[PDB]
Design a protein around this ligand. Structure first.
Ligand SMILES: [Zn+2]
Ligand SMILES: [Zn+2]
Lengths: 114, 118
């Protein structure tokens, strides 16, 4: 059994053509998990995960801040204490329009990798 | 399967009492349940002060994230308390349980493969 403070997992900085101002922690990855993986994302002020889709779902819980969720058309802001279920193949992305860091838990089935 | 995305305040789900031979002082909210989940389910558990999930095991894993409070985790050998911001991975068949030794509610997210129910 693994018990660990999430913050202590080293975050990975992401800065690409589609993702900027984002850090990813893999809390429960493919080494350990037989079916699905647990990640924790931190979105800096102004950070962006641009619209994309994939053949697997997301299950998300917003831990801190106000997260802007991009939809195929339009967007919706939600707060700490919201959960989000993104169906497979649905277009989605994320932005942080606030002045402080936003954090969310994100789980995907193993085929999504970590 | 269906398209779209659900975005919902977890507290809009009513916390339902869990009461079994091996659980007392616990409530649960099913957030992403069997009716919708392709692969795994998301629950939010509330452990009342003094609540207890006795040591047990089952043929599926748990993935847990502690949202609020100090959670005492029961292991096959001894126990360890963790707090908000900790995650826990419980392997299939590993003995585990939980206690809330504090005077306030403890909350944690708990995800299992959907073959284990909701
Ligand atoms: Zn995605
Ligand atoms: Zn269990």
């Amino acid at each position: 059994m693994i018990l660990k403070r999430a913050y202590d997992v080293t975050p990975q900085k992401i800065s690409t053509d589609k993702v900027r101002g984002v850090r990813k922690r893999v809390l429960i990855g493919l080494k350990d998990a037989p079916n699905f993986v647990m990640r924790l994302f931190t979105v800096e002020p102004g950070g962006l995960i641009d619209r994309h889709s994939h053949p697997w779902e997301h299950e998300i819980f917003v831990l801190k801040g106000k997260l802007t969720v991009l939809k195929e058309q339009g967007e919706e802001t939600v707060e700490e204490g919201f959960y989000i279920f993104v169906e497979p193949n649905e277009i989605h992305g994320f932005r942080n329009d606030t002045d402080s860091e936003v954090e969310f838990l994100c789980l995907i089935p193993k085929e999504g990798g970590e």
